[PDB]
């Protein structure tokens, strides 16, 4: 679920999902068009694609379980949808951590009109 993803993001990065990732660049928190602005935005692009791979799942609300094996996120077995959603979120959280070094506050609340063009998954 979105809330679980947000807790995972905070655990991983020490930033609150809202507002650090909820309106960032062209893809973070609100997904659709444009060239991603930076690596963090690309994490969101890929995460959007990952959810897009699951048209008959409901990632905003469906809850999954996961645990930490010293640091590492391990998705626990739920329904097929839950497992796949968890893997998408895990990847994005790791991606955010891997790209914290280039995270830029200037991309928070990034205006829609600067995001133009479709980029294929």
């Amino acid at each position: 679920s979105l809330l679980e993803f947000g807790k995972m993001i905070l655990e991983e990065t020490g930033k609150l999902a809202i507002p650090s990732y909820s309106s960032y660049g062209c893809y973070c928190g609100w997904g659709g068009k444009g060239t991603p602005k930076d690596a963090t935005d690309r994490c969101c692009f890929v995460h959007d694609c990952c959810y897009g791979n699951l048209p008959d799942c409901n990632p905003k609300s469906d809850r999954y379980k996961y645990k930490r094996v010293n640091g590492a996120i391990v998705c626990e077995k739920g329904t097929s949808c839950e497992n796949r959603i968890c893997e998408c979120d895990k990847a994005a959280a790791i991606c955010f951590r891997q790209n914290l070094n280039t995270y830029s506050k200037k991309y928070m609340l990034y205006p829609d009109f600067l995001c133009k063009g479709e980029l294929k998954c």
Binding site: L2, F5, G6, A17, Y21, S22, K60
Partner: peptide, 4 residues
């Protein structure tokens, strides 16, 4: 809350 959030939507990506």
């Amino acid at each position: 809350l959030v939507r990506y």
